Amino acid sequence: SFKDLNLTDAQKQQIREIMKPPLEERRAMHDIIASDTFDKVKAEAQIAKMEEQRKANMLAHMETQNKIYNILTPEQKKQFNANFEKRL
Amino acid sequence: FKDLNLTDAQKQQIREIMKGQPLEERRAMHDIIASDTFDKVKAEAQIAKMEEQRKANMLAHMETQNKIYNILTPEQKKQFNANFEKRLT
Numbered sequence: 059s060f061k062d063l064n065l066t067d068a069q070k071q072q073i074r075e076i077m078k079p080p081l082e083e084r085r086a087m088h089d090i091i092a093s094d095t096f097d098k099v100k101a102e103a104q105i106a107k108m109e110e111q112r113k114a115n116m117l118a119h120m121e122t123q124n125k126i127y128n129i130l131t132p133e134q135k136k137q138f139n140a141n142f143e144k145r146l
Numbered sequence: 147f148k149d150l151n152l153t154d155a156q157k158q159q160i161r162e163i164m165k166g167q168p169l170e171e172r173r174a175m176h177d178i179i180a181s182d183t184f185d186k187v188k189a190e191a192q193i194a195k196m197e198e199q200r201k202a203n204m205l206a207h208m209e210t211q212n213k214i215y216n217i218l219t220p221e222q223k224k225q226f227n228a229n230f231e232k233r234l235t
């Protein structure tokens with residue numbers, strides 16, 4: 059939550075600079091779920107299918123969040139970390 | 147939408163299904179984000195570790211939903227399947 063940190067105008071521009079759900083996966087889950095048996099082998103295959111895309115997405119997310127973290131003041135960092143701890 | 151008109155035997159059964167069917171990953175993520183530099187190889191390791199938990203969580207979720215689907219009447223399964231198309235998890 060980067061909104062409730064009282065971002066300065068410079069920080070808002072910096073975040074803009076930094077920042078610049080497939081139905082296939084649902085249909086595969088549906089085929090596993092709507093069946094008269096639970097096929098664990100087929101489910102594990104399903105779960106693993108978009109491993110690479112997940113990796114790319116989560117690396118992008120974590121890098122972006124790290125970049126934004128590092129434009130914060132020490133006061134804002136403490137708030138961001140406190141918020142991080144009180145969520146899950 | 148649980149607009150499926152669940153039999154008390156069905157609901158009893160569902161609760162039973164659910165009854166049957168952590169922090170480390172989060173703190174590691176936190177420590178990657180709250181770091182002076184982004185460490186890609188470390189982030190990749192965190193992501194790979196999270197794939198373990200995701201597989202456990204997804205298998206339990208699909209198994210649970212499958213068990214539910216199979217306590218349903220033909221008309222309720224049609225409805226369950228229609229609801230499925232509108233949902234995202």
Ligand SMILES: [Cl-]
Nearest residue numbers: 084085088231
């Ligand atoms: Cl679907």
Ligand SMILES: [Cl-]
Nearest residue numbers: 143172173176
């Ligand atoms: Cl944490």
Ligand SMILES: [Zn+2]
Nearest residue numbers: 071072073075
């Ligand atoms: Zn700039």
Ligand SMILES: [Zn+2]
Nearest residue numbers: 085088230231
């Ligand atoms: Zn579907």
Ligand SMILES: [Zn+2]
Nearest residue numbers: 085086088089
């Ligand atoms: Zn199908």
Ligand SMILES: [Zn+2]
Nearest residue numbers: 097098099100
């Ligand atoms: Zn199979």
Ligand SMILES: [Zn+2]
Nearest residue numbers: 098099102201
């Ligand atoms: Zn396995």
Ligand SMILES: [Zn+2]
Nearest residue numbers: 106107109110
């Ligand atoms: Zn793999």
Ligand SMILES: [Zn+2]
Nearest residue numbers: 109110113114
């Ligand atoms: Zn790769």
Ligand SMILES: [Zn+2]
Nearest residue numbers: 118119120122
């Ligand atoms: Zn993101």
Ligand SMILES: [Zn+2]
Nearest residue numbers: 119120123175
């Ligand atoms: Zn996040």
Ligand SMILES: [Zn+2]
Nearest residue numbers: 118121122184
């Ligand atoms: Zn980058």
Ligand SMILES: [Zn+2]
Nearest residue numbers: 180181182183
């Ligand atoms: Zn430092």
Ligand SMILES: [Zn+2]
Nearest residue numbers: 198199201202
């Ligand atoms: Zn495993």
Ligand SMILES: [Zn+2]
Nearest residue numbers: 206207208210
């Ligand atoms: Zn679940």
Ligand SMILES: [Zn+2]
Nearest residue numbers: 096166167209
């Ligand atoms: Zn089981």
